[PDB]
Amino acid sequence: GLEAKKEENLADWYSQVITKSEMIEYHDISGCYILRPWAYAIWEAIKDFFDAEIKKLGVENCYFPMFVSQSALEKEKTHVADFAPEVAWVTRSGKTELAEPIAIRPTSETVMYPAYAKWVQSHRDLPIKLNQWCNVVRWEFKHPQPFLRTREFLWQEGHSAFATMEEAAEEVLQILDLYAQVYEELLAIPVVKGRKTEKEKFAGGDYTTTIEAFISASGRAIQGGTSHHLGQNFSKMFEIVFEDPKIPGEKQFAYQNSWGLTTRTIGVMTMVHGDNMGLVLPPRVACVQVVIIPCGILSEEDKEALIAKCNDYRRRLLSVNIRVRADLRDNYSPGWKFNHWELKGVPIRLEVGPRDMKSCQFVAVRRDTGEKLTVAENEAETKLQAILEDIQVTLFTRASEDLKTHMVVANTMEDFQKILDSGKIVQIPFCGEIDCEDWIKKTTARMGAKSLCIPFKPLCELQPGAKCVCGKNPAKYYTLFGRSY
């Protein structure tokens, strides 16, 4: 059972949920954590959904080397300047120092695009759509947290190159909607689409799209995923050129995109849905949606009938494609199994006792609400299918309910401060300049609010002639601000 409470010390509560659900194990290297099968099954459920959707878009899977030459890093100066401090360098082979150190990729733009230049020669060679599921190392000296901010993490990174900028722009918005589907349709988490500001965008690119989720217990928001439009900045310095289809001899730089989604999705799932009895797995991503546990255990003949009914319930649920597992381990107490699968977040626990079986009834226990329903054997697969749909809805409904009440609009730095101190997120009219974004972070700390995203669909239309909260420059858009990981 858990120790620390979520409302109290959230940090120790988050560490207790990921360990006692058997998702995360620690490692003697700070910032690096172990993905145990219970956590890895969720990332595979996200992988199979995202891989199937991007393959429809013509995206193909591959794998590129993990070592970056120092010659390829300095190709894009702006891109290498923002990633320079968090690039882990290999400097020794065994015990002697390498004559030339090599870098571990925080991102493989400079690994793939040198090859993109060799492959792109004509218009027929476009569009290239490559993606890889791999690990990357970003050595941030901030104090890490599992899933939320790790120094090594798994992700997918797609790198697409187009002949025109129209198709490159429409793929960014489609990958962003796929990222939003993962959070809203699989993890039951509401997100806010938006564009990153000139300060919080991918250096070396054109613009950055992102999805931001809100964690009610901490009052902070977090970037769930990013889809970037690179334009021609990388193709200019990597010489990714192709011949014109109609005009002979004429050449044009390719328009490129890059999009990534990391294992942070799992930690956001726990921070939003996890309570004080452990984890809560959304039914769409729960590898075990229903668990059958026999209880009430005298006679050895009725015991053989109690185990047969549990098998009968498993076969009745597997027929309607419900992921059900029967925990029939005699070496464990039935009360032990209840608290075990509860910490792991199984949506429904199916209790079958000898008295309940003789009464043609079973007990379904909902993980999200804790409610107890004595369902009949005939209405098993129907109600259990109906309860599975209800848990996914309730998790999204109440998480979006906290989003609807903690995302308010303010127009003055006085309201901006008091609202932020109550653990909420604010939409403000913003000028967009970087030096004003620096002023907002320094002033709100006296910690410090950061820009989260410029919502595509803000809560209110920006009033004509309205100035930013700086008062010096006019406001260009409503921008979402708040404290973030």
Ligand X SMILES: Cc1ccccc1CNc1nccnc1C(N)=O
Q: Binding site for Mg(2+): what residues are annotated?
A: 223
Instruction: Assess contact for 447 and 483: CB atoms under 8 A.
Output: yes
Token readout for 332 is 């464990």
Looking only at the bridges linking them, the beta strands covering 128-137 and 60-61 are parallel
Residues 90-129 that bind a second copy (CB under 8 A): 90-96, 98-99, 101-102, 104, 111-112, 114-115, 118-119, 124
Q: How far apart are CA 149 and CA 169, in angstroms?
A: 29
Q: Spell 381-420 as b/e; 16+ CB within 10 A means b.
A: bebbbebbebbbeebbeebbebbeebbeebbeeeebeebb
The least distance separating ligand X from the CB of residue 153, rounded to whole angstroms, comes to 4
DSSP 377: S
DSSP 270: H
Choose the contact partner of 58 out of Sr ion, Zn ion, ligand X, none; CB within 5 to 8 A by kind.
Sr ion
Annotated binding site for Zn(2+): 431, 436, 468, 470
Check binding of 203 to a second copy (CB under 8 A).
no
- In this complex, which beta carbon is closest to Zn ion, that of residue 436 or of residue 480? 436
Instruction: Assess contact for 399 and 189: CB atoms under 8 A.
Output: yes
Q: How far apart are CA 434 and CA 457, in angstroms?
A: 22
Annotated binding site for L-proline: 107-109, 138, 228
Looking only at the bridges linking them, the beta strands covering 290-294 and 348-352 are parallel
Looking only at the bridges linking them, the beta strands covering 152-162 and 128-137 are antiparallel
Residue selected from 21, 150, 392, 479 as contacting ligand X according to rule CB under 6 A: 150
- In this complex, which beta carbon is closest to a second copy, that of residue 319 or of residue 331? 331
Check binding of 107 to ligand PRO (CB under 6 A).
yes
Alpha helices by DSSP H, listed for 319-453, are: 334-344, 354-358, 380-406, 413-421, 434-444
Q: How far apart are CA 139 and CA 106, in angstroms?
A: 9
Binding mask 234-273 for ligand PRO (x = CB under 6 A): ------------------------xxx-------------
Choose the contact partner of 392 out of Zn ion, ligand X, a second copy, none; CB within 5 to 8 A by kind.
none
Residue selected from 226, 235, 256, 270 as contacting ligand PRO according to rule CB under 6 A: 226
Token readout for 375 is 């369902």
For ligand X, which stretch binds (CB under 6 A), given 69-77, 145-153, 212-220, 234-242?
Answer: 145-153
What is the binding site for a second copy (CB under 8 A)? 25, 27-30, 32-37, 40-41, 44, 60-69, 71-72, 84-96, 98-99, 101-102, 104, 111-112, 114-115, 118-119, 124, 130, 134-135, 137, 139, 141, 152, 154, 329, 331
